[PDB]
Design a protein around this ligand. Structure first.
Ligand SMILES: [Zn+2]
Lengths: 340, 142
């Protein structure tokens, strides 16, 4: 049990340095040792992989290793990601050692003949390394071919494959850190937001708030993250299409009064010109009449627990800004009218 | 409704006048559909001066409510509309002299002196003479 610690950390070291370009001394001995360690790990995954305290202990070791590294400063190393990556750790190492250019000639020959012995062992009960790589290559091709022949960017982002997928990747990674309780998820998410492409990220979170629960801790963390950071939520609410954020609301009543707040204040910072009978903004970045109309359009074609909310938030802002009954005058009169 | 005292329904009616001046054309004599007013109602004069009229009429109700930025918007538009009224420039310049006089005011002074009644219909001529202030030239030479 404690025997497994020194084994797994040593293999984790070797796995991280797998990618690294120091390889002159390495040999058949290193390679054979690596693959037999990986078989041992893959064998444990099979033997006592479920319903054990050793299971949870190894995940403590994983997460605390993966947070002392962070993804910051010395190496943004992926690492073996979870206990299920135990089942194909061999594969990680092997793929990465192909990618290692510095791999010396005779070691590479012994390597490739140890990975690819041939059809001499065509008969195996155990899914050997050759068959494992097979199924990978096949799938990889498989995904290229579907993407480029019959894939379509679904409008309804919630039901897209890729958005659905990236959402569920994120939620695994959040559930781990939630249970670990080492750092707050807030920190993790804030750092993500700063590091990677924001346009993608937002859309995903969006899609993640909508997937039903799988083990709603995930959604319940991200809403508190978002209410915590208004400034990202100002670009969130601005960047997406309308129906997405509308069904976001009927799910999480906690986002409704703030979102209507955002536009309520976006409405008031226009001005109507009589030459073109249209509201317009002063600066380049001020939301159009059509995008604002759009968003309130969607919120009205929704469930009754949001209809009354949006209706009354507009009536109370109409009365506030003179209860006129004509255009030219109140952005809010314009809306109420435009709905019939 | 101004004489009666009703700010609300006043600004209503000025806005409704303005909407049918811009979000319609009076000169659609594409189809001779009837018997119709040749003269009094088509004159480009009657358009630009009727715009100015309702824009100032509404600007005064904005001044009454204390929304002098909106009043400035309507007065600034009427200046672009009919630059040969001077009732327009008068109201605009009095508002600038209330708030932020110098550069704006002088820029419009030099315009007036650069600038320096053909067939206006009667109810409109009469309406302008009604609303215009006596202390007009006095203010414009200051
Ligand atoms: Zn006529």
């Amino acid at each position: 049990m404690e025997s497994l610690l020194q084994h797994l950390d040593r293999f984790s070291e070797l796995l991280a340095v797998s990618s690294t370009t120091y390889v002159s001394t390495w040999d058949p001995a290193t390679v054979r040792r690596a693959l037999q360690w990986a078989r041992y790990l893959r064998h444990i995954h099979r033997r006592f992989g479920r319903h054990g305290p050793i299971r949870t202990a190894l995940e403590r070791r994983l997460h605390n290793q993966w947070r002392q590294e962070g993804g910051f400063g010395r190496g943004p190393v992926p690492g073996l990601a979870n206990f299920q990556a135990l089942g194909h750790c061999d594969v990680l190492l092997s793929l990465r050692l192909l990618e290692n250019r510095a791999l010396g000639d005779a070691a590479r020959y012994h390597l490739v003949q140890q990975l690819f012995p041939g059809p001499g062992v065509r008969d195996a009960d155990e899914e050997t390394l050759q068959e494992s790589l097979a199924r990978l290559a096949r799938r990889r091709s498989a995904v290229h071919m579907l993407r480029f022949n019959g894939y379509r960017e679904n409008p309804n982002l919630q039901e897209d494959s890729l958005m659905k997928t990236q959402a569920e990747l994120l939620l695994e990674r959040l559930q781990e850190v939630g249970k670990a309780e080492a750092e707050r998820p807030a920190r993790f998410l804030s750092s993500l937001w700063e590091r990677l492409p924001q346009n993608n990220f937002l859309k995903v979170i969006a899609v993640a708030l909508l997937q039903p629960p799988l083990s709603g801790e995930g959604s319940q963390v991200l809403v508190h993250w978002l209410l915590g950071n208004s400034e990202v939520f100002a670009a969130f609410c601005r960047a997406l299409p309308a129906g997405l954020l509308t069904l976001v609301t009927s799910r999480h009543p906690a986002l409704s009064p703030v979102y209507l707040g955002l536009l309520t204040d976006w409405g008031q910072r226009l001005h109507y010109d009589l030459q073109k009978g249209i509201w317009v903004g002063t600066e380049s970045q001020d939301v159009p009449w059509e995008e604002l109309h759009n968003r309130f359009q969607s919120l009205c074609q929704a469930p009754p627990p949001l209809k009354d909310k949006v209706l009354t938030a507009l009536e109370t802002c109409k009365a506030q800004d003179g209860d006129f009954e004509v255009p030219g005058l109140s952005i809010w009169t314009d809306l109420l009218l435009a709905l019939r | 409704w101004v004489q009666l005292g009703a700010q609300k329904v006043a600004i209503s009616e000025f806005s409704r006048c303005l909407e049918l001046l811009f979000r319609a054309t009076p000169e659609e004599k594409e189809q001779g559909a009837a018997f119709n007013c040749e003269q009094g109602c088509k004159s480009d004069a009657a358009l630009q001066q009727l715009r100015a009229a309702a824009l100032i009429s509404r600007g005064l109700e904005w001044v009454a409510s204390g929304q002098d930025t909106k009043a400035l918007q309507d007065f600034l538009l009427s200046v672009q509309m009919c630059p040969g009224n001077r009732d327009t420039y008068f109201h605009l310049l009095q508002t600038l002299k209330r708030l932020d006089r110098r550069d704006e005011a002088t820029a419009l002074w030099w315009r007036l002196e650069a600038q320096t009644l053909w067939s206006l219909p009667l109810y409109l001529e009469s309406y302008l003479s009604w609303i215009r202030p006596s202390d007009r030239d006095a203010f414009l030479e200051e």
